[PDB]
């Protein structure tokens, strides 16, 4: 019932926007660990670990998702980080082992998240073929279908198209149950989380383009007795004033790196776009919204602590369950933003409760 | 010049031998963060973590070898640790990447052990096919040229005939240049070592039985014009005096696990028995030369302190550059070998010298 | 300079319509034996089957293209057979040894059509992954390759994204040099035959549509220095009178099958519609083009002899070189086009000729 | 039961032995046609046509199985032709398809030879992984399920480690029920003919050695319920001296090509020496043995008319039913066979008959 918080670890050199502005945010561990720790102080339940092998969207350098997710649990206590994983390039067998062993050193806190791709380039560079929209959501329900099998069943059996387990004994087991994200908007991509996922994570949007969303979720979810939770991109600028938080947004889509948004938004049309019905991750996205990679903007978590309070629980009202919230200046903005964002949520919150 | 010592990590349930006598010994990240504190101040260089799917060799748990290995590089400050992979399961564009990241957190000091394969049950279980003996070092080799040139270069492309790059550039690349090892013994293994490895680790064998193998590779690696060093598995049972050691061996033997020896021996005639010489890893063992599942007695590093120093110049003589120890109760023995037998290696080096 | 003609061969039940109409045409060999002999009576140089591994409604019998195009070479002298294949479910060293032989046996007269799919519910019945859709004409890009190379010299070696050969040597190779022909068009269809194929063969369109995909194609071929042609389907119904003509394609249009149509529409929408460009096979046909399932009725050969051999003309002077045949009635129409329609094709050339 | 007759298409430039000794046989269509009329009209029931992509044991031109025993089958009424195939460059749904139409179009004749591989240079050359002897045989195995199941059922499923299918409806079917034989003579060869083969066909060996196979594939089958028949290759040579029939067979050894003969022979050491048990193909085979390319001079079919008929009728008292020939020079010896020693194989099998 509470809504969750994520935040979106900067393990990519360029931060979470498309910009050549000045950014206290750096993609190295040291930063990270602290970031890690100040989210988890500050009321965030997950990080989330992007994936990428090679750079786009102004991301030179990248850590490795899963290697750089260990060392952030490693520095926290209670924090759940979730890890990116491209089927493809990663097979479920080993996925299934790592996250089990890491899992059992981190006292039970990785978790997952499956996304299906839209870099082509990127899987061309790295020699992994290029499989059509919707069957990429036939291998990733494939692969959450193993990770959870294999977790879970003494000794697992899957006879699928892309992926074959026979009897597979997988030891230690995770401690508990990880939980499974996934990442996409398309048609394919919902009916995924309404089957499989315990996540549905999507782009940034209006509260209108997230309900129909959240809505054909919950009516396939249901049909098919199943459970799944809807979390929500959003850049979050909280400013003491409107005025400054306006202000930014313009200093960040001013300073753009065009060469980078036009190349992300080129290779971006493998997404939605591509998809049968046209519709997903980046179909609708102008240049001024590719500045935030994921449409982080369209969320329009834009303005005072109360202004972003507000707008946080009017999504609440559509059925998002975890706002998974992007910044400009990492940490000084996570720990504003448990000071002075979260409580006033939790205010609303407990205001609606009696009530 | 100086000898290099490197110790198994038991990141495997059953220690290193296939018996049920009682072990001070542990296969979880408590006892294995201490083991490997005491291994880097008793004076060895390298941890090896070795790479399993499933139970084998009574190994019920293992936990999976580059996570593991990244934890206990945590917790260290001086010790290198080497990775085992296994190509199939493994791919060489995500074992790049995360070992770079890996090498970015630890200063440097991951290192890799490709092996190639033997236990034919367990890729079955996790869906992959069972290439030929040869075919196996086939893929290996391209594994390695794809890791080395990815570490190595921006733009790099390769077009094998099991893994095809295109312009692939990897960023952050590792710290420095990670070392490449491997382990296997048969023809294949040798040749492969001479073309593309930084060191060749075979199993335990008597001082003539490695000195074929070194000049087998010696000649090879000199026509090819490459440079490769030689480590050698050894079981070490140090005990004040002989006949103590040879009593643990024996307590070790006598309480062999015969389902286990069993069942391992039968796996294990899919790698030196399988090769077109027949000869390579398990081809010449006994059940009591299984019970050490990498024929670790054979080296006979087994009596006083004095005599294994001694064993170990001997081995030296043949060119052996490191000397890959197995123990029984891992902790304690560590520390025993770091005070008393390390030491002796050092004076019977000191002594060389001055002559 | 002639302009040349092939038919469909009718190796699919149902013949080449989606409708209910009485056909005096049949898929069994008994037929096509006979069709093939009046065909190459007729003057039809080319005879085209499809390729189809499951289908369908009346669809539901076809015969395999490569062992039926042989039986129809082994009945006939002069004719020439193009065989559909479709990579994935077919492999290039089979396909060019194949192929080889039976141009051994059949004095020279075997050619392939090669044609990158659309139909994803039959790759995944057969256990094919389904590749985007430009990559799908990648792999068939590497797969004319691989033949043209394999019967054009021995010790062939490719280094693909998706076929290796190494120093392969074919014997015995084919006769002479076998024509390469490709099925559609979308962008990626005619930058593949641009760099690689003999024939471009295209769905049927306006004069307009059909000097579009020309001029593409010409302005391409000529940067890579490569020759190609240029065939194009239609569905010819040649009648006594205009009138006769417009009323057979009313009734077949009239007694469609809906179901089979909207279903064939639907899985259609993997073709052009797919495409990077949404251009291609399928990309604009209503439910009346889709009655003919290569769009045959947009090429507009319907009425009197007269009007079919002038608009056959007029098709040459914007760079057509071949056109494809179909037939509702196949034995009765092939021989009244040989008699009727051809030699008058073959007049108004002549009289060009004459100026 | 009578005892069958197949002979070896010789499809293949140097026939049936690795020899540079004048032989009247061809392996082009013509000289194949007639022999397979004069060989139906001898009584063989079966004509057996071996599967190559590149030059073997001096078969310098090889015509590939499928298609040429199409053409064969087209030349004759009664004669049962069996094709090669070797999973790998061949893939079931395409074998099931064509196969499927050839016996449509002769009248249920074509039978399939499942191979399992042994010349793995061929394999590299045409871009296939050379997977490990018994796995092979996994992969034939599944190869053998899906064709038989594809044939018999509608909507046929087939969850496989090497070979998928969904609901697939393959039409037409075959008209009756193909037998499967395979090749091949290790205890994986024996284990796969006694769960899903009608034919087991092995190598030429002694009398005691064919008795070996069938007494172990006797009691698989009779545990699995299942029926298998034996056939056994035999190089006959039978002239009206047996002092004629031993110097041809002098001749053709003398007149080995030696460097041909101990190519193959290497080769040959990835069939029964690479298997784990050390037996099957050419596991034992000396120079001389290996002139004849499937150990057929052991079977000992060499002397009189007589001679050769009785050894025929002791086979069958050790459990053969068929007898696979080969012969130096084809048409005329296959007449020979015909006239010469069939008939006194049916009067001695209508002498046993009568006590
Ligand atoms: C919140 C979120 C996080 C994502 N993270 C990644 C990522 O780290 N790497 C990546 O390649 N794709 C990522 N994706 C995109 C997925 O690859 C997605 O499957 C792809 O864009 C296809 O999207 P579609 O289903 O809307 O067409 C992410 C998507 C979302 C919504
Ligand atoms: C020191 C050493 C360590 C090894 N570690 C592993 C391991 O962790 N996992 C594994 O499957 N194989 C391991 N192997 C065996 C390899 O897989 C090897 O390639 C296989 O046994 C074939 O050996 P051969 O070339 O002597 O036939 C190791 C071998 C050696 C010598
Ligand atoms: C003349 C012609 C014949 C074709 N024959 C076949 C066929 O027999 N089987 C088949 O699956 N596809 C066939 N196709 C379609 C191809 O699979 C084509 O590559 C696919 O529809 C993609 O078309 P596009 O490039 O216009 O998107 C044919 C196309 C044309 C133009
Ligand atoms: C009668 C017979 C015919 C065979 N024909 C072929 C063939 O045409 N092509 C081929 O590559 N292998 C052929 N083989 C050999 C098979 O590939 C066999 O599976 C391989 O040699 C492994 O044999 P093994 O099971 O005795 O080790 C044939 C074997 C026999 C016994
Ligand atoms: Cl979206
Ligand atoms: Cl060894
Ligand atoms: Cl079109
Ligand atoms: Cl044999």
Same mark, same amino acid.
């Given at each position: 019932?509470?809504?969750?918080?994520?935040?979106?670890?900067?393990?990519?050199?360029?931060?979470?926007?498309?910009?050549?502005?000045?950014?206290?945010?750096?993609?190295?561990?040291?930063?990270?660990?602290?970031?890690?720790?100040?989210?988890?102080?500050?009321?965030?339940?997950?990080?989330?670990?992007?994936?990428? /092998? $090679?750079? +786009?969207?102004?991301? #030179?350098?990248?850590?490795?998702? =899963?290697?750089?997710?260990? @060392?952030?649990? *490693? !520095?926290?206590?209670?924090?759940?980080?979730?890890?990116?994983?491209?089927?493809?390039?990663?097979?479920?067998?080993?996925?299934?082992?790592?996250?089990?062993?890491?899992?059992?050193?981190?006292?039970?806190?990785?978790?997952?998240?499956?996304?299906?791709?839209?870099?082509?380039?990127?899987?061309?560079?790295?020699?992994?073929?290029?499989?059509?929209?919707?069957?990429?959501?036939?291998?990733?329900?494939?692969?959450?279908?193993?990770?959870?099998?294999?977790?879970?069943?003494?000794?697992?059996?899957?006879?699928?198209?892309?992926?074959?387990?026979?009897?597979?004994?997988?030891?230690?087991?995770?401690?508990?149950?990880?939980?499974?994200?996934?990442?996409?908007?398309?048609?394919?991509?919902?009916?995924?989380?309404?089957?499989?996922?315990?996540?549905? /994570? $999507?782009? +940034?949007?209006?509260? #209108?383009?997230?309900?129909?969303? =959240?809505?054909?979720?919950? @009516?396939?979810? *249901? !049909?098919?007795?199943?459970?799944?939770?809807?979390?929500?991109?959003?850049?979050?600028?909280?400013?003491?004033?409107?005025?400054?938080?306006?202000?930014?947004?313009?200093?960040?889509?001013?300073?753009?790196?065009?060469?980078?948004?036009?190349?992300?938004?080129?290779?971006?049309?493998?997404?939605?776009?591509?998809?049968?019905?046209?519709?997903?991750?980046?179909?609708?996205?102008?240049?001024?919204?590719?500045?935030?990679?994921?449409?982080?903007?369209?969320?329009?978590?834009?303005?005072?602590?109360?202004?972003?309070?507000?707008?946080?629980?009017?999504?609440?009202?559509?059925?998002?369950?975890?706002?998974?919230?992007?910044?400009?200046?990492?940490?000084?903005?996570?720990?504003?933003?448990?000071?002075?964002?979260?409580?006033?949520?939790?205010?609303?919150?407990?205001?609606?409760?009696?009530?």
């Amino acid at each position: 019932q509470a809504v969750k918080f994520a935040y979106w670890v900067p393990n990519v050199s360029g931060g979470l926007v498309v910009s050549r502005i000045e950014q206290r945010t750096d993609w190295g561990i040291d930063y990270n660990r602290k970031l890690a720790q100040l989210a988890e102080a500050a009321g965030f339940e997950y990080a989330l670990t992007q994936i990428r /092998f $090679t750079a +786009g969207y102004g991301a #030179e350098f990248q850590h490795e998702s =899963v290697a750089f997710s260990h @060392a952030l649990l *490693a !520095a926290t206590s209670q924090l759940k980080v979730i890890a990116a994983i491209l089927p493809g390039p990663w097979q479920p067998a080993l996925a299934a082992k790592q996250l089990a062993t890491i899992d059992q050193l981190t006292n039970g806190r990785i978790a997952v998240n499956i996304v299906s791709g839209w870099f082509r380039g990127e899987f061309q560079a790295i020699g992994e073929h290029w499989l059509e929209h919707d069957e990429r959501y036939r291998r990733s329900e494939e692969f959450i279908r193993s990770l959870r099998g294999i977790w879970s069943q003494d000794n697992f059996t899957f006879r699928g198209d892309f992926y074959r387990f026979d009897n597979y004994s997988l030891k230690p087991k995770p401690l508990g149950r990880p939980e499974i994200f996934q990442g996409g908007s398309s048609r394919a991509a919902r009916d995924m989380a309404a089957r499989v996922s315990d996540w549905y /994570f $999507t782009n +940034g949007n209006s509260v #209108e383009g997230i309900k129909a969303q =959240v809505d054909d979720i919950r @009516a396939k979810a *249901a !049909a098919n007795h199943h459970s799944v939770k809807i979390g929500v991109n959003a850049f979050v600028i909280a400013r003491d004033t409107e005025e400054e938080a306006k202000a930014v947004l313009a200093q960040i889509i001013d300073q753009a790196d065009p060469e980078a948004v036009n190349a992300f938004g080129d290779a971006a049309k493998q997404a939605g776009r591509a998809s049968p019905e046209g519709e997903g991750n980046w179909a609708k996205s102008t240049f001024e919204d590719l500045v935030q990679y994921n449409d982080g903007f369209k969320t329009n978590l834009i303005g005072t602590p109360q202004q972003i309070a507000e707008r946080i629980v009017a999504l609440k009202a559509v059925g998002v369950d975890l706002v998974l919230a992007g910044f400009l200046h990492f940490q000084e903005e996570v720990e504003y933003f448990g000071q002075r964002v979260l409580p006033l949520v939790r205010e609303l919150e407990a205001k609606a409760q009696s009530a």
